[PDB]
TrEMBL record:
This is beta-lactamase. The keyword Metal-binding applies. Its cofactor is Zn(2+). Mg(2+) 2 binds at residue 12. Mg(2+) 3 binds at residue 138. Zn(2+) 4 binds at residues 87, 167, 209. The keyword Signal applies. The gene is blaVIM-2. Zn(2+) 6 binds at residue 220. Zn(2+) 5 binds at residue 122.
């Protein structure tokens, strides 16, 4: 079963194998008095690993690298951060010093620099317009438009029908909005519609925080985002 927030102490990282050569990574963090789970992705590409998002902080990201070596034993050669918040780029300097090439859109890199968050080294071109998609090795990167943040990307693994929606997508047990300080509430449902229309075939859908599901997570998130818009 998928590890939930209560089952993971802060500092430890779990890996959940989804398909041949595709995992999620799950960590936990204390924030504003509560403990939150956090998801990322791992995708094999030949004999190297592509990492999607840090494990939320230097300590968790060191643990993530150690659990990868233990359970997979293939090197992480590139990483992509899906937006500029600390749960996605916090740990980038740990990755960089381990030899990982860190990537993010110019939008994400600009926003991280402004916030004082760690900044991925390389830039992802071709993603500035809503609906833009680019191939990145074993995944497609998709910019659906502004949602949880103006820069959020989603990641699709075509070999496995896995769609990592990041923080643009809510888990079912979340029935109220999360951190929406950087969000575009007016555009969020339209951006979700772009995800549905671009990956209607997705089978396994992973939120940025919590339990995966199917494409019904998109409808769930639209429901929650609209109830927050109206209250
Ligand atoms: C579980 C939502 C609260 N949260 C904590 C850290 N990041 C978030 C988010 O909404 O993206
Ligand atoms: Zn965020
Ligand atoms: Zn988050
Ligand atoms: Zn729902």
């Amino acid at each position: 079963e998928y590890p939930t927030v209560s089952e993971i102490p802060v500092g430890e990282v779990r890996l959940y194998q989804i398909a041949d050569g595709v995992w999620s990574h799950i960590a936990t963090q204390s924030f504003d008095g509560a403990v939150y789970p956090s998801n990322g992705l791992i995708v094999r590409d030949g004999d190297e690993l592509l990492l999607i998002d840090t494990a939320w902080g230097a300590k968790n990201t060191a643990a993530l690298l150690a659990e990868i070596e233990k359970q997979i034993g293939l090197p992480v050669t590139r990483a992509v951060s899906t937006h500029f918040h600390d749960d996605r780029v916090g740990g980038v300097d740990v990755l960089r010093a381990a030899g990982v090439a860190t990537y993010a859109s110019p939008s994400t890199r600009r926003l991280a620099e402004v916030e004082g968050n760690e900044i991925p080294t390389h830039s992802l071109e071709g993603l500035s317009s809503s609906g833009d998609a680019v191939r990145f090795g074993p995944v497609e990167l998709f910019y659906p438009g502004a949602a949880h943040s103006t820069d959020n990307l989603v990641v699709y693994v075509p070999s496995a029908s896995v769609l990592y929606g990041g923080c643009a997508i809510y888990e079912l047990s979340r029935t109220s909005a999360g951190n929406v300080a950087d969000a575009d509430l007016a555009e969020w449902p339209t951006s979700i519609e772009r995800i549905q229309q671009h990956y209607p075939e997705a089978q396994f859908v992973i939120p940025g925080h919590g339990l995966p599901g199917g494409l019904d997570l998109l409808k769930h998130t639209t429901n929650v985002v609209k109830a927050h818009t109206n209250r």
